[PDB]
Amino acid sequence: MKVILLEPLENLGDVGQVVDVKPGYARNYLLPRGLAVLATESNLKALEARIRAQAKRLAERKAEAERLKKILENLTLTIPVRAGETKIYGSVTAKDIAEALSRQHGVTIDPKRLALEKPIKELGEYVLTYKPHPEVPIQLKVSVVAQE
Amino acid sequence: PKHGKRYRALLEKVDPNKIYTIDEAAHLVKELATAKFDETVEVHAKLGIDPRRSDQNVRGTVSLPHGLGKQVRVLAIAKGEKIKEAEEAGADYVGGEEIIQKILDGWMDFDAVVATPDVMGAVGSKLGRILGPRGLLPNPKAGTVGFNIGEIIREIKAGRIEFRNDKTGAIHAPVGKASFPPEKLADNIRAFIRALEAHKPEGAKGTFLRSVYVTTTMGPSVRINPHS
């Protein structure tokens, strides 16, 4: 009984499986529900439909990721800070990075995913680690300096 | 998981997972154990029979066609030229009705008894009493009675062994010498393969030669595949 799972993994553990639930057992016991279907070149196709789908989606993520990876790991990011010869008056928030690079230079990235324990206000610059995608981390030359 | 046997190195040599084959066996055994002298490697096995009905209590002998001069003493019981022929060939114990008489008194220094048909009546009836309930009496269907006394003990010392199954169903016998030429050891493993397959009673049904192994006296244990 090629039982196809909609919301199953031997509990509501959803799509991603198909197991044998013996005759009727399977039938009206485990799949009448709203939890699955059965074989059919049709259902198998379904699996192929979104296996493909996601394979291309993720592939893509990888891709756009790469375009930004390269553009950014390539270029430098200089920012107009205001203060003394160390930490500016009100810090460099990696989000400060975010919008500054975003619309003053070209490409944006959400604040969040980056590498900023505490805003940095030392000034000068450091190239840091902000991972735009979790296997592909984008490092970059971030310099801010007192245009005081 | 560790035991009491410096055998430890040698056993390390071992590795029970593949009941492999004959010649392999000769070689690995040979390398396996030359303790204080050279291993008395041997072969041991069991048969899917059942002695509770002697209709399959097997024995006989395959003359390992290789040199010897030892094992299971034998008495050649007969007369004149037979005593000649027999002792000559190679007999541990030799004589006629006087040696049998010695037995009646209290002497059976002979595990096996090979008597020629010129003293079979005397052997079987005088010593019927003495040798019957053990198995040490010449029997005309038990490799123990024949005019061929010289041929018989001859073999006993030129290259003898023979068979016999013990209680629950197994056979025990020497199929080669330790340091001996491997190929050779193979030759003998086979000698046994054949003679055995032969003796193998007709009251079988399935796996008869169940477990056939090359193992040594005080040494390794290697199951073997005497098919190849």
Binding site: R27, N28, P32, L38, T40, S42 | -
Partner: protein, 71 residues
Amino acid sequence: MKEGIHPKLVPARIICGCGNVIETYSTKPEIYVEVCSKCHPFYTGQQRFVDTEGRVERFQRRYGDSYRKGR
């Protein structure tokens, strides 16, 4: 007609016998059954969309209703 099958026809007939063998083990059989019988399947249902049923019979049944499970 009120119980052929539905996923085809399984509604009828048959004459049935009996004796007591020993054929290829010893001798002839033994025969004395000029008897007659029934012999049939079973019924069940599911739903078009809240409202349905079935009727039907056994096997041809099961994989069939499945067929309408496809639609």
